[PDB]
Amino acid sequence: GAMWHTHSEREKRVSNAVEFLLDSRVRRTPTSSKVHFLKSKGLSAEEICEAFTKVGQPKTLNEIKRILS
Numbered sequence: 001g002a003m004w005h006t007h008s009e010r011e012k013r014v015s016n017a018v019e020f021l022l023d024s025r026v027r028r029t030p031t032s033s034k035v036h037f038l039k040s041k042g043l044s045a046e047e048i049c050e051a052f053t054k055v056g057q058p059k060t061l062n063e064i065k066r067i068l069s
């Protein structure tokens with residue numbers, strides 16, 4: 001309907017991403033693989049960046065954009 005729920009939808013993407021990044025096997029995959037996965041789930045580059053900072057493994061915004069280019 002008329003309510004897009006943009007904020008809660010963005011929050012769910014980032015929290016799902018944080019949970020992905022913390023998975024035991026996912027942690028032992030390269031940053032590029034993780035970035036590509038999150039992009040395929042509809043995260044923006046900023047949201048990917050935010051998720052990496054939240055798991056204590058900050059990546060610069062430019063690093064994310066380079067992987068996705």
Ligand SMILES: O=C(O)c1cccc2cc[nH]c12
Nearest residue numbers: 016019020021023025026037
């Ligand atoms: O998206 C996840 O939370 C997730 C968790 C554990 C393994 C995989 C593999 C792709 N995605 C995963």
